[PDB]
């Protein structure tokens, strides 16, 4: 009935909020199912739809992208979020649609791309677009995936699996890896992703679990770091997050560990 996720204080975002840094001026493309801009606790700054049968990026039929927007804004309240819709009612999107989203983010000078989406395969064209975004200076963050462990295999999804992307896995309030959080050498950092409370369509709130909400926290944290260091490059934003993370378990399962946006914004 109007929650804030425990994850905001777990990544130490409050420490930036009290310095007066809240993501002001940072363009964040939420590449997802869209965002219910009808929600009174959300500011959407604009958007576009690359789903051919669904022209409206501000209608969230699946309720995923609205949750994403909320979690990004809980970390970075004055961030400018753009609803970039590449996922249909079925919850999946063609590579051509997702690539259209990424090309859009580059053309409209997004500072941060959040991709709370995955699949088990890549494409040369997908990797090309993600790399091109990071070359042009965009911080690209993506959910590591919800495939759990599978012996010695990487279970990290594309595009999080690409080295040009910040792959984000999910811990709970105890910094324990969620059993469904994907794993592998491509896993970069962890953030809260268990029962994360946020905005849902129709002026509602509720908890989602997944690496999607984990990655939402990191995209938020990037917007908080660029609030404070507006002249930092994506390389510097990414190093700050990785080099100041709180170490947890092995890097196969946890990567660098829990992000600490407080320590990151001092680096």
CATH number of domain containing 165: 3.40.50.200
CB atoms inside a 10 Å sphere around CB 232: 18
> Measured between alpha carbons, how far is 215 from 201 in angstroms, rounded to an integer?
20
The domain total for the chain is 1
1 inside domain: no
Tokens linked to 129: 């677009």
Question: Which residues have a Cβ under 8 Å from the Cβ of 150 and sit 6 or more positions away?
Answer: none
Domain span at residue 169 reads: 7-264
d(CA 189, CA 256): 5
Q: Is residue 233 part of a domain?
A: yes
Contact yes or no for 28/219 (Cβ under 8 A): yes
Residue 134 in any domain: the answer is yes
Distances (CA, A) of 138 to 105, 109, 235: 9, 8, 9
Query: For residue 235, is it within any domain?
Result: yes
Report the alpha-carbon distance of residue 147 to residue 267 in Å, rounded.
33
Angle at 167 between CA 222 and CA 139, to 5 degrees: 35
Q: Is residue 23 part of a domain?
A: yes
| Separation of alpha carbons 167 and 187, rounded Å | 5
Q: Which of 3, 71, 7 is closest to 258 using CA atoms?
A: 7
Cβ count within 10 A of residue 161: 23
Resolution (A): 2.7
Contacts of 120 (CB under 8 A, 6+ apart): 147, 157, 158
What is each CA distance from 181 to 64, 97, 171, 184, 260, in whole angstroms? 17, 26, 8, 10, 19
Is residue 156 included in any domain, yes or no?
A: yes
- Residue 2 inside a domain? The answer is no
What pairing do the DSSP bridges indicate for beta strands 80-85 and 44-49?
Answer: parallel
Which ranges of the chain would DSSP assign to H, the alpha helix? 7-10, 14-18, 64-75, 95-107, 124-136, 211-228, 234-243, 251-254, 261-264
Residue 131 located in a structural domain: yes
The CA-atom distances, in angstroms, between 86 and each of 18, 22, 148 are 35, 27, 25
The encoded tokens of residue 42 equal 């959300």
Method: X-ray
């Amino acid at each position: 009935a109007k929650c804030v996720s425990y994850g905001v204080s777990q990544i130490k975002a409050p420490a930036l909020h009290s310095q007066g840094y809240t993501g002001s001026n940072v363009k964040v493309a939420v590449i997802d199912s869209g965002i219910d801009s009808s929600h009174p606790d959300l500011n959407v700054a604009g958007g576009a739809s690359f789903v051919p049968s669904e022209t409206n990026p501000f209608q969230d039929n699946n309720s995923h992208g609205t949750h994403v927007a909320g979690t990004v804004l809980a970390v970075a309240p004055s961030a400018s979020l753009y609803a970039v819709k590449v996922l249909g009612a079925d919850g999946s999107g063609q590579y051509s649609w997702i690539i259209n989203g990424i090309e859009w983010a580059i053309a409209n000078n997004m500072d941060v791309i959040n991709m709370s989406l995955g699949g088990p395969s890549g494409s040369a064209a997908l990797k090309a677009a993600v790399d091109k975004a990071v070359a042009s200076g965009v911080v690209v963050v993506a959910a590591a995936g919800n495939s759990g462990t599978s012996g010695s295999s990487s279970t990290v999804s594309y595009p999080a699996k690409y080295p040009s992307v910040i792959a984000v896995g999910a811990v709970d309030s105890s910094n324990q890896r969620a059993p469904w959080s994907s794993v592998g050498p491509e896993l970069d950092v962890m953030a809260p992703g268990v029962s994360i409370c946020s905005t849902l369509p129709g002026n509602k709130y509720g908890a989602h679990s997944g690496t999607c909400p984990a990655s939402n926290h990191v995209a938020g944290a990037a917007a908080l770091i660029l609030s404070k260091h507006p002249n930092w490059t994506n390389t510097q934003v990414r190093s700050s997050l990785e080099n100041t993370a709180t170490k947890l378990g092995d890097s196969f399962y946890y990567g660098k560990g829990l992000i600490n946006v407080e320590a990151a914004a001092q680096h």
